[PDB]
């Protein structure tokens, strides 16, 4: 089998710096990253003891808002108060402010329990925890463990050998849909594999690039009403988007099985898409393809959206084309030389709602309907923009407060709490006159990138813990064996060292002989060690001229321009490593050589022709 | 008015220094020659560079029992 293996602590000193120069290096921008919460809790709970009470506090506040009913919200509000707020003032180690406590005080004797009852405290939980606690976390071996994980994030570059495909489940356009699995861990995703040679044929390169670009902005925060993209990659003969996978089918197929649908049935389902639409409208995207056939369902039965295809950006540049499924179009998109916005979706939605009731499509409405639904669909499907809903100012909220969605609350729909009305069961050679061109492979850069967040989750459910310990299990048996062999306190301990790590030099620019060694950067030198010894090989910063990068048999590598009419070889394991050397590497020598001129003893002898 | 009195204190510090060095009584060149010539010739006998001492007495060559 295959399982991904972490790097070592050495990366910390390399990585730490990598982030600091970006800025994603504070209380928020680590915590935010749910792992950076997980390792925080793993730290804050298990090691620090002033933090533990604020964590079980914070964790149990999330388990108050996320509760089912309002009558059971009080039972947990009494479990909390008596302890997590009360107890801390009995030991008198409650640092929280007056107006903070007098909000929860007055309203937990009044008893009214809105979810934004304990919110003025949540910001003070944050407030205190970013002071020292945050800092003193940094100085932890868990904070290290993070870096180890985070490197693997920026090392991840995908292949086809990494995947274990089972079946096939789609054909259309440029490629075919494969139902894939991740062999490293083990979970079902959706590969949308494309055959490269058919894109230059049809010239659908604007739409192919578009369909990639859109997935990203959509697939940011988790939204179970949209099939989010996870990873993207290209190979010399194939292209693939890796996304969520679902069993069910589509609304066109189940309209065949069940037939026409009920009032309370469609209400639930229609509520699913509006939040997907909200997630599209809030980050400025239009699907331009609202259809029952283009909507999927999972093992539970909850719904999502499928073939983006025609989704183009309205962010800044509005497209005035005649785009859409010939049927679910508003009177704005159809016109030639006229702009439109979310209207193109809202109209297509109302068009879809009819089909999820009757079965065909033609304004007038039927007889045996309810009073609220007439006021709804007449608004959705109005010819003008100013008179139609969702195009006045709010957007998705004009749909929310409608009398149809009056009984239902908009926080329970949010969490898939309402049940699905019914359950789903569970029982070539055309193009051989086109080749691999070099003008085609120029525009495939800027394609393969993974979402920082969506991946972090992938691990959260699967095998984070069982790896966490298993690497720790060998981090002991390493240092244990390191001790057996007589210890060494990591060379760059108390000095003015900046950073250190791993790299591969070729012993001499001539042979084909790669030796990998460990390196230590200094203000005035560079040393490096092998397996056992303490440094016996060396290079000053005086000795260097400049430092460039270069391609080596299609591998980006480091040149070390030598003062004495020669050069030197380098190579890294991961991608980012390379970088942070270069940055403070390029600076260290220049600032080293800068102050060489100012000193009389240390200087190079003055030139004299 | 700033660097006027700043360079004056320095210029006054100079005349203080100049008068300090001028005070000392001096000795003629012949007096120093003999004192330190004779010193060189007085301690010239006991120099291991001038007198290439025996190999055994010399540690870095071959002095025997150490430690």
């Amino acid at each position: 089998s295959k399982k991904i293996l972490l790097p070592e602590p050495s990366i910390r000193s390399v990585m730490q710096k990598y982030l600091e120069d970006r800025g994603e290096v504070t209380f928020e921008k680590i915590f935010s990253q749910k792992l950076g919460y997980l390792l925080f809790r793993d730290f804050c709970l298990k090691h620090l003891e002033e933090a533990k009470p604020l964590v079980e506090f914070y964790e149990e506040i999330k388990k108050y808002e996320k509760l089912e009913t309002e009558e059971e919200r009080l039972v947990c509000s009494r479990e909390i108060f008596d302890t997590y707020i009360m107890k801390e003032l009995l030991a008198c180690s409650h640092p929280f402010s007056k107006s903070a406590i007098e909000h929860v005080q007055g309203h937990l004797v009044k008893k009214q329990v809105p979810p934004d009852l304990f919110q003025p405290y949540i910001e003070e939980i944050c407030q205190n925890l970013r002071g020292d606690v945050f800092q003193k976390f940094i100085e932890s071996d868990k904070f290290t463990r993070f870096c180890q994980w985070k490197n693997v994030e920026l090392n991840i570059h995908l292949t086809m050998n990494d995947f274990s495909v089972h079946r096939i489940i789609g054909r259309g356009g440029f490629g075919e849909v494969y139902g894939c699995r991740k062999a490293d861990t083990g979970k079902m995703y959706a590969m949308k594999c494309l055959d490269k040679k058919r894109i230059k044929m049809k010239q659908g390169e604007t739409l192919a690039l578009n369909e990639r670009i859109m997935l990203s902005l959509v697939s940011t925060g988790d939204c179970p009403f949209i099939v989010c993209m996870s990873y993207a990659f290209h190979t010399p003969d194939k292209l693939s988007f890796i996304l969520d996978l679902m069993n069910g089918g589509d609304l066109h197929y189940h309209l065949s099985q069940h037939g026409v649908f009920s009032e309370a049935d469609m209400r639930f389902y229609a509520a699913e898409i509006i939040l997907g639409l909200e997630h599209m409208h809030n980050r400025f995207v239009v699907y331009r393809d609202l259809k029952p056939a283009n909507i999927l369902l999972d093992e539970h039965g909850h719904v999502r959206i499928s073939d983006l295809g025609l989704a183009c950006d309205f962010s800044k540049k509005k497209p005035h084309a005649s785009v859409g499924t010939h049927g679910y179009m508003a009177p704005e998109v159809l016109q030639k030389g006229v702009a439109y916005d979310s209207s193109a979706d809202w109209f297509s939605l109302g068009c879809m709602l009819f089909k999820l009731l009757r079965g065909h499509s033609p304004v007038e409405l039927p007889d045996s309907f309810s009073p609220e639904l007439r006021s709804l669909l007449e608004g959705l499907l109005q010819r003008d923009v100013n008179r139609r809903l969702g195009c006045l100012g709010r957007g998705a909220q004009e749909v929310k407060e409608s009398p149809f969605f009056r009984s239902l609350d908009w926080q329970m729909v949010f969490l898939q709490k309402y049940p699905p009305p019914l359950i789903p069961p569970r029982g070539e050679e055309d193009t051989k006159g086109i080749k691999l061109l070099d003008s085609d492979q120029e525009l495939y850069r800027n394609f393969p990138l993974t979402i920082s967040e969506r991946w972090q989750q992938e691990v959260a459910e699967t095998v984070f813990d069982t790896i966490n310990a298993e690497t720790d299990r060998l981090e002991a048996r390493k240092k244990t064996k390191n001790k057996q062999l007589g210890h060494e306190e990591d060379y760059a301990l108390g000095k003015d060292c900046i950073m250190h790590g791993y790299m591969s030099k070729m012993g001499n620019p001539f042979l084909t002989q790669w030796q990998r060694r460990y390196f230590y950067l200094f203000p005035n030198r560079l040393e490096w060690r092998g397996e056992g010894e303490a440094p016996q090989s060396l290079l000053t910063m005086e000795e260097i001229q400049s430092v460039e990068e270069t391609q080596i048999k299609e591998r980006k590598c480091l040149l070390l321009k030598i003062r004495g009419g020669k050069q030197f070889v380098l190579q890294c394991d991961s991608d980012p490593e390379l970088v942070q050397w270069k940055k403070e590497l390029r600076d260290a020598y220049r600032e080293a050589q800068q102050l060489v001129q100012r000193v009389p003893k240390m200087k190079n002898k003055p030139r004299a022709p | 008015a700033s660097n006027n009195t700043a360079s004056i204190a320095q210029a006054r510090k100079l005349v203080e220094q100049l008068k300090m060095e001028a005070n000392i009584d001096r000795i003629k060149v012949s007096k120093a020659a003999a004192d330190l010539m004779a010193y060189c010739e007085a301690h010239a006998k006991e120099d291991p560079l001038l007198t290439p001492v025996p190999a055994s007495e010399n540690p870095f060559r071959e002095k025997k029992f150490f430690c």
Partner: protein
Amino acid sequence: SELDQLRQEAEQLKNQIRDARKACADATLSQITNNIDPVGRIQMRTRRTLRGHLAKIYAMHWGTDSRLLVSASQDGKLIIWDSYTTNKVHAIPLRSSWVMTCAYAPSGNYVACGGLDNICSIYNLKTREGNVRVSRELAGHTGYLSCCRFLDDNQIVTSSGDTTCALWDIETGQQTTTFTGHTGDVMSLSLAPDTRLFVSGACDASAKLWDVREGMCRQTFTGHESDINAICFFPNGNAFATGSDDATCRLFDLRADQELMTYSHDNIICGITSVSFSKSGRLLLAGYDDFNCNVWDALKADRAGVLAGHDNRVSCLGVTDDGMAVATGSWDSFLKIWN
């Protein structure tokens, strides 16, 4: 016009103080010395091969017990070696890799060093264990640390790159007195054996004597063309000599108060790094740039011989207190011994 009344009263001082010197000077050393026996060619042999430092070596210092030494190098470490056996007694890394000078206490118990940390870092060799640790951190000067020399195991004096020296009390870590006087950056300083007097050089091209206990300059010495790198003292406590980037050496007397002899051969272009006398004093050695020192009949000023062996700049040197042999610190990362 008082600034004018000081400057015109300085040219008259300069010319009259120099007339007091030249009224004394009638004969030279060459006349005095021409009579006596010549040195003969002293051609030493390499003895020891101190493989150790990896980066370039800078200042060294001699262990008072004539078998040990501390040597400073760019590699951010200071080593203590046994000269007899070729064994590195202890290896120590500095807190700041910007090292310049190293020293050795008279007792041979504690040690000091430093550089562009702008600090004199100090350690102890035998604590209440054996593991070597930092004793104290010394700050004060704005610029770098050029050179440093002990009094005993309770006081010390340094020279810095803010154009001033300073005396220090080990107990406290405070300046006993201060020695403002040089306009150029101070470089090398030399102790009196009696330890109540000292001399030092600077980039302005002047040498100045200093009363140790009081805290002021006693004499000014002018002559050198370029920067004054090296310096050393004559055994009797009333004579000293220096080297420079001009590519010459000069000798000076104190009571007499002037230059005595110039050591300038016409096939010499490169500068000196640190100079030193013999036990007898007749022999002077300059840390040349051409990877070897030259001996000088300090009396007649004739070149005795050369120590070819290094393959890179000679940064410093020193004699054993008993005049037995000679060390040589060099940029080729080696230390060899000659007798």
